[PDB]
Amino acid sequence: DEAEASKFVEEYDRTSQVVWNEYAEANWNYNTNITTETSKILLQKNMQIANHTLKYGTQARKFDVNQLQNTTIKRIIKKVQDLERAALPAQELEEYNKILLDMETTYSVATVCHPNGSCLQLEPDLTNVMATSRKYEDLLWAWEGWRDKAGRAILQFYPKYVELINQAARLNGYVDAGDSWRSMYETPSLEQDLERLFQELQPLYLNLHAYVRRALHRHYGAQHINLEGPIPAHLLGNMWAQTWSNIYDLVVPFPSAPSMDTTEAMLKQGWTPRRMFKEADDFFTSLGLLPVPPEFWNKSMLEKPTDGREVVCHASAWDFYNGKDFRIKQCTTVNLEDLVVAHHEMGHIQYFMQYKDLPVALREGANPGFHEAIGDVLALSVSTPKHLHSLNLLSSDEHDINFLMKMALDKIAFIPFSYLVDQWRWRVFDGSITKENYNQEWWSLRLKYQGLCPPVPRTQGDFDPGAKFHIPSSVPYIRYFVSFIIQFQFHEALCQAAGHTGPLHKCDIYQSKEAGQRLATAMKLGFSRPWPEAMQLITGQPNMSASAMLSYFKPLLDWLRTENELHGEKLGWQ
Ligand SMILES: *[C@@H]1O[C@H](CO)[C@@H](O[C@@H]2O[C@H](CO)[C@@H](O[C@@H]3O[C@H](CO)[C@@H](O)[C@H](O)[C@@H]3O)[C@H](O)[C@H]2NC(C)=O)[C@H](O)[C@H]1NC(C)=O
Ligand SMILES: *[C@@H]1O[C@H](CO)[C@@H](O)[C@H](O)[C@H]1NC(C)=O
Ligand SMILES: C=C(C[SeH])C(=O)N1CCC[C@H]1C(=O)O
Ligand SMILES: [Cl-]
Ligand SMILES: [Cl-]
Ligand SMILES: [Zn+2]
Predict the structure, then answer these.
(1) 394 to 244, 255, 382: CA distances (angstroms)
(2) Can you say which residues are annotated as belonging to the binding site for Zn(2+)?
(3) Which domain of life is it from?
(4) What CA–CA distance (Å, rounded) separates 465 from 454?
(5) How many structural domains comprise the chain?
(6) 470 classed as catalytic
(7) Whether the CB of 529 sits within 6 Å of ligand 1
(8) SS3 at position 172
(9) Parallel, antiparallel, or unpaired for β 111-113 and 119-121?
(10) 219, 224, 399, 470: which one is catalytic?
(11) How far apart are CA 45 and CA 43, in angstroms?
């Protein structure tokens, strides 16, 4: 009966703690030291963790969730009925694990070598190149090189990963893996919800896109930039053209109101990775949110190790399910871009900390977008000129439009990219897209949503999606599209809670205890209630809505329209 359901839930949570704890360490030992031994150990703890998942998932399914009074118990047991990969037969489960690990190693150890010299790693050698070069051919070298090395080598692994994860999903009662992922939002209208949100941010993006294309035309020359066509994917200052802030100089609305070189200022002033995470820590405490435990500074990996040992460089935050041990792993570089990433990751840690008293089953984000948005909200305030000037990294209507542009190159530009990744991935999981149409359909979406074309035509053998961490790493990506919309909603709520008046882009919530209180009450819920309840606690209303973001950039939209009009731009790509 009911009494048996809660004994079960209590038994699940305590054994899950221990086992999830042993898994995370082994996972961490591999991530921060990629070698054969750590892999072998990670592969072994995988069987263990699966042995545990099966035992408890099998039991959970013997419960009729319908007969259960307590909703909290209802929801845990229902979640425990999802075995994930552990639904797989033992041989396929061991193959599946091997595939993932092989895909992750492949991605993380890949290099792009000059004919007779330097071999370059994605972080930060290729990343730096993408950000800083303005020579069409060097950009192309790195763009194509990364795709030829990480992309192509992921291709051999992907169709079978796809086969196995779909089988896992069908074995857990889903139609395919994407359906399973989407299910994490508990929102049957998810797809239409996101599509409507995407349509709302269009005038803003089409206008950004056209303005940026006009500037690229001006720097790279008419022969390379068609003013009525897609932008070559390699000129946006970022390996994936996902954020465009690194070409700010080429696009600056008013060079007449020049801005400081932040990276100069950071390096010159003895900024360090440690100091960047310490300032993020300080920002969270200014709000009366939790500080990171001493142990965090002992255990984290906040910069690229010097050992000559391979690591997964891509930033991640780690909950050890201890209530005590929390870590970040980042190959942090000293620039403004990674300052923002350090806040993003610190929002993860803060979320682990707020909900650490919940049962581990419910130790997760209200939805995955919420988990991604926390740190970004604070970073919206960090990124203000008034906050940046106080960090000694910066020094007036002109400056205001420059700021919004800077922010727009980061935030608006990512909207179609974050929409596209899982539009392609869902259509792969459900069979619309086969290993023969992988790359072509990836670029039909790059064109449709982002207005990009590949600068080099793609050939059979290319698997460009394999060149983005999340594909080989099998981490869903819609979470980030949801993150970008909602964080603006959170920022607007927190700003009004903090008493601030007038144009929303001028808000800085540093030290606002009222804002900290809203986020905290929301984060403590973990995954115990459906997300609209947290949405409500923060914003006073239950929906996702693009309105705050439209409102944040409204002055920029006006300026972009005027400006694209007078140059006679033709928005979009025919
Ligand atoms: C269904 O079962 C759950 C889980 O056993 C019940 O939720 C739990 O309810 C207790 C008592 O309301 C909560 O404790 C409270 O929270 C804090 C910290 O523990 C404390 O300071 C308060 O004074 C109070 O004791 C507990 O947090 C809560 N647990 C969870 C995971 O939500 C729930 O009440 C049951 N529902 C019904 C309708 O009986
Ligand atoms: C890398 O792995 C080896 C052997 O598996 C281990 O002894 C060593 O501690 C690891 N290196 C670092 C820096 O942790
Ligand atoms: C910060 C992370 C690691 Se959780 C990340 O991967 N981000 C942050 C936003 C989307 C994105 C990306 O790399 O593309
Ligand atoms: Cl690409
Ligand atoms: Cl997600
Ligand atoms: Zn994140």
Answers:
(1) 20, 15, 12
(2) 344, 348, 372
(3) Eukaryota
(4) 12
(5) 1
(6) yes
(7) no
(8) coil
(9) antiparallel
(10) 470
(11) 6
